Write a protein that binds this ligand. Structure first.
Ligand SMILES: *N1c2cc(C)c(C)cc2N(C[C@H](O)[C@H](O)[C@H](O)COP(=O)(O)OP(=O)(O)OC[C@H]2O[C@@H](n3cnc4c(N)ncnc43)[C@H](O)[C@@H]2O)c2[nH]c(=O)[nH]c(=O)c21
Length: 399
């Protein structure tokens, strides 16, 4: 059974890009004081940037190697990576591996809790055979009890447990799993449940409204990892192959940047209901959130996140003491754990390296690198005669 907010999500599924962008544009606005500040900071972070991906083969080794950056203010979220589960036995192997990881992480956490201590990150596609194409009934029957069991194990140790986000046609299933989990009696009062949402989806703002509703109804604070989205190519491909009325995601990168900012504001507005975790390696996005979060930061207000191997050089400037030239804002490192061989997944994941490749391009000016998304959309509208038009090289599926 659904709440009104929950039922509201469907409509936005693949709504016209011009409409979606129009609704959101001004919501992504940086106040003038904020915008100038964010630009200056963004500039100095990217400029400083213009001047290894596996944390450990086992969780014990990952934990051993974590002190170095934890001492500097970083936090960690560990994920036992590997291929999607194909059989129930694969799923169970992953289950066993997650359980063992939680005992180890919990022990190392040693009562640090869900904010300051490390946490676990899980992938639903690891926990159910052929999840990408699995049926609702079977997921609820077989996946849910695993998710609940892992979550209770994390509560026992008081560590955060985060649910990943995958392809857009998995969204609704994942939300049902989240809703049921939030009403478990044994989880009452505990706020360590975490969930990923993807800004590149047109449904994202509506998903946020539902999450706010859910946190309210279930009397908790949700830990929400806001990312841009990792599956853009395949989202575009699948909609074309299926001949849909439109895309579930934006087709221009700047639109996703606009969406991320508008969504970040919505998250920050409700400190009682949400602990926002801003996962980005983009220097402007970081700087903007930093200013948007306002004055009088406190540790439990929010955190940044990044991928191991991609984010440290940026966040070395952010996490740490102000006396040392840092910003004193925590960053949680997402740390893949497993045999280095199984790192092939990393290589498997252009779209997702937009900013990091652009900052590597020393022929690209820093000022265009850290340009305001909203301002850029207005410029595009000026040139093209209308706001929020789809990428010119990507027509609708039925074209
Ligand atoms: N897991 C997860 C967990 C953590 C801790 C992090 C930090 C990230 C992920 N995650 C990956 C994430 O979704 C992004 O792919 C990644 O963080 C890179 O984004 P960012 O650092 O913000 O750099 P950017 O500014 O260059 O953005 C790139 C981003 O823009 C979108 N894009 C690209 N091209 C586009 C076009 N033409 N039109 C619209 N949008 C376009 C893409 O989203 C691209 O990624 C991750 N991702 C998940 O989906 N789910 C997860 O659980 C995690």
């Amino acid at each position: 059974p659904q709440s009104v907010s929950r039922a509201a999500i469907t409509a936005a599924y693949r709504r016209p890009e011009t409409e979606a962008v129009s609704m959101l544009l001004e919501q992504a606005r940086l106040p003038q004081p904020v915008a100038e500040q964010a630009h200056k900071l963004a500039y100095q972070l990217a400029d400083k940037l213009r001047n290894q991906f596996v944390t450990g083969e086992t969780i014990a080794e990952a934990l051993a190697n974590a002190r170095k950056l934890e001492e500097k203010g970083f936090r960690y979220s560990y994920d036992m990576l590997g291929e999607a589960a194909l059989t129930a036995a694969d799923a169970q192997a992953y289950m066993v591996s997650y359980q063992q990881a939680i005992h180890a992480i919990g022990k190392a956490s040693n009562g640090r809790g869900i904010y300051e201590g490390p946490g676990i990150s899980i992938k639903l596609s690891a926990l159910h055979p052929r999840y990408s194409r699995a049926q609702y009934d079977r997921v609820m029957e077989e996946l849910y009890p695993r998710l609940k069991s892992l979550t209770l194990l994390a509560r026992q140790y008081d560590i955060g447990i985060n649910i990943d986000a995958e392809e857009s046609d998995r969204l609704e299933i994942s939300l049902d799993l989240l809703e049921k989990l939030c009403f478990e009696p044994e989880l009452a009062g505990w706020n360590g449940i975490g969930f990923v949402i993807q800004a590149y989806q047109k449904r994202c703002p509506l998903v946020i409204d539902y999450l706010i509703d859910l946190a309210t109804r279930s009397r908790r604070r949700l830990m929400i990892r806001l990312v841009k989205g990792a599956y853009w190519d395949s989202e575009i491909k699948r909609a074309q192959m299926d001949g849909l009325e439109g895309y579930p995601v934006y087709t221009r990168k700047v639109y996703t940047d606009v969406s991320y900012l508008a969504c970040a504001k919505k998250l920050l507005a409700v400190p009682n209901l949400i602990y926002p975790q801003f996962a980005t390696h983009n220097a402007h996005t970081l700087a903007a959130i930093y200013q948007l979060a306002g004055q009088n930061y406190y540790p439990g207000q929010y955190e940044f996140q990044c991928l191991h191997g991609m984010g440290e050089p940026l966040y070395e400037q952010v996490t740490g003491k102000v006396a040392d030239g840092k910003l004193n804002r925590p960053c949680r490192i997402y740390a893949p754990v497993g045999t280095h061989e199984t790192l092939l997944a990393y290589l498997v994941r252009g779209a997702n390296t937009s900013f990091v490749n652009r900052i590597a391009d020393t022929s690209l000016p820093l000022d265009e690198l850290v340009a305001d998304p909203v301002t850029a959309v207005e410029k595009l509208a000026q040139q093209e005669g209308q706001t929020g038009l789809p990428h010119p090289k990507i027509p609708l599926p039925r074209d």
